[PDB]
Design a protein around this ligand. Structure first.
Ligand SMILES: NC(=O)c1ccc[n+]([C@@H]2O[C@H](COP(=O)([O-])OP(=O)(O)OC[C@H]3O[C@@H](n4cnc5c(N)ncnc54)[C@H](O)[C@@H]3O)[C@@H](O)[C@H]2O)c1
Ligand SMILES: NC(=O)c1ccc[n+]([C@@H]2O[C@H](COP(=O)([O-])OP(=O)(O)OC[C@H]3O[C@@H](n4cnc5c(N)ncnc54)[C@H](O)[C@@H]3O)[C@@H](O)[C@H]2O)c1
Lengths: 320, 320
């Protein structure tokens, strides 16, 4: 009966097999615009692999379209306004990768502290004697500043405070101090104190008007020159030209970045030049386990809409 | 009264200041052989920064020499036989870097699981789209095999089993099963079972005739092709040409290496070619905190010998 189009593969094939048991599924990978246009014309549901964009032209051509599902939390690459105008349900698939992002964050904190990429390059260049000039940092007793004490911020705080014996400060205007106590952190109401105290600052807030570009030049000026920034949250929490300035002018010692603004990043991003900035391509939340959870959630919500059942994660509820 | 020669700096200046309060200290850095010969002639004590060698010629020229201290555990670069022959006390400074090496090991396990160096290179090359071909590994529920359940092996096991929710197996013929239970690991008497079960194998044994080259080609053949090797113990625990073969032939998925055989490694080490092997220059145990502990221990033992007091860590006790 119903046809479904996957614009990009899911993060695990289980969701494709689930859809195929109930609908006629077509998958297109890294498609050109004309392939989207030809394949979307008669489908009832669409899945979009982040960060691929789904625009008003494609939505206008999709004469039978009832539901659009993203692959994870982010919907900024979907023209939601055009979908809402045509009564199309947009769902996302959030909150299914807490463990993945927590582990990734720990990996990046440790890689910066142990100067992993730099020391690796030195040894492979024949400069083992770099060990007379550079030492790793011991995490024990250092201060980690967490911005955003939500699901991931809490999980990172708990591991860093207990297993790694770090002092953990958390800034989050919307939680009680008891939430920080639970994970052996201290809630601080003054972001300036977190900035001046922290040896590592890791960003985990929801992206809002309040947190958009909250990490700008003024924030980097307050950080310790020896401190590192980690961002696995959203690219727009950081003002990218200001991070460039902060790295080049040595306002901070380095950064680890999994998220970008814009997404995908341009090929000539000015941050790539700096050996003390390390990158991953928005993969903090994409392990096989997290991908399977997100694939099942995306497939289930598509099937729900096609059967007239309300899905859990509607982004534009006024269409229902 | 007494003069002391530092062949290389200590890992922290506190030990140099402690020595200078009681002796006349000279420091030479990355010295040529003739500088060692001229500076050692009349000193009562010598400190040697790893992995610098102190040979029979230098010891024979050191007419007043009473004590040699290494910087850490390893004494293989000292001609102990020549020192013992002249009645010279050799001390090492062991067991002061458990936390440093534990943290470093975690950093390397996580960096391999999250494909850190590879994904960083891809993004900086403009290949963010590598995220359609490569996914990180989620550590939760995977099996870590620890070889050697001593101070560092136990500390790594405890963090990986509790904080990271890994299944931990330990091989160590000289501990009771209760020691593994304490850190939420399982002791296994069959090394083959650890090899076939593990997704990550991390080496932490003492180097003995039994553990020398225990990780040879036969061992790599039993490991999972998807598994990784981590070595922060001693270079001689691994048969280096066999690790080269294992990496090139894809018997294992990668490795992280902090220790080398020989030390220092040659500039054209065949392992450097492989992007899935990451290196650090024998720095797992050298944070500022661990360096300060080792520097104080080295300075104290030198001063002890110069005052006729027996130091804790004599390597050649038959001279006392
Ligand atoms: N890189 C990835 O692949 C990936 C995957 C999942 C989530 N994320 C992102 O990671 C971040 C954390 O995810 P989560 O599941 O823990 O979200 P969450 O909703 O559980 O927690 C977010 C926290 O941000 C806090 N916050 C709101 N305004 C703040 C402010 N002005 N200052 C400080 N904190 C503020 C909220 O009070 C909340 O506690 C989100 O931005 C999420 O979209 C990224
Ligand atoms: N990379 C560095 O900078 C650095 C720093 C400190 C220590 N190390 C090395 O790390 C390793 C671990 O150090 P540690 O302080 O935990 O030592 P430790 O003496 O506390 O423990 C070593 C363990 O090895 C075990 N062992 C002995 N024979 C074994 C065998 N055949 N198979 C498996 N296990 C066996 C012993 O029973 C013991 O439990 C040592 O080789 C040490 O020299 C490296």
């Amino acid at each position: 009966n119903h046809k479904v189009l996957l614009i990009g593969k899911m993060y695990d094939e289980i969701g494709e097999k689930l859809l195929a048991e109930y609908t006629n599924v077509e998958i297109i990978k890294e498609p050109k615009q004309h392939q989207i246009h030809e394949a979307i014309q008669d489908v009832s549901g669409v899945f979009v692999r982040y960060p691929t964009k789904l625009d008003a032209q494609a939505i206008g051509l999709a004469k039978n379209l009832k539901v659009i599902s993203t692959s994870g939390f982010g919907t900024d690459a979907i023209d939601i306004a055009a979908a809402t105008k045509r009564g199309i349900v947009v769902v996302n698939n959030p909150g299914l990768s807490t463990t993945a992002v927590t582990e990734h964050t720990l990996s990046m904190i440790l890689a910066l502290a142990k100067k992993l990429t730099f020391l690796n390059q030195c040894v492979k260049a024949g400069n083992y004697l770099i060990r007379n000039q550079v030492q790793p940092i011991q995490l024990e007793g250092k201060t980690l500043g967490i911005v955003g004490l939500g699901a991931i911020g809490s999980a990172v705080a708990k591991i860093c405070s207990t297993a790694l014996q770090m002092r953990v400060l958390a800034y989050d205007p919307y939680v009680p101090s008891g939430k920080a106590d639970t994970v052996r952190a201290t809630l601080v109401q003054d972001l300036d104190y977190l900035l001046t105290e922290s040896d590592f600052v890791s960003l985990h807030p929801e992206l809002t008007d309040e947190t958009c570009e909250m990490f700008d030049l003024e924030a980097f000026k307050k950080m310790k020159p020896s401190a590192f920034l980690i961002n696995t949250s959203r690219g727009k929490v950081v003002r990218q030209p200001d991070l460039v300035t902060a790295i080049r002018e040595k306002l901070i010692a380095g950064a680890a970045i999994d998220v970008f603004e814009p997404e995908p990043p341009a090929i000539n991003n000015p941050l790539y030049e700096f050996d003390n900035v390390i990158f991953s391509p928005h993969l903090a939340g994409v392990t096989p386990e997290a991908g399977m959870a997100a694939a099942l959630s995306a497939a289930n919500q598509i099937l729900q809409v096609l059967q007239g059942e309300k899905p859990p994660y509607i982004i534009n509820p006024k269409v229902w």
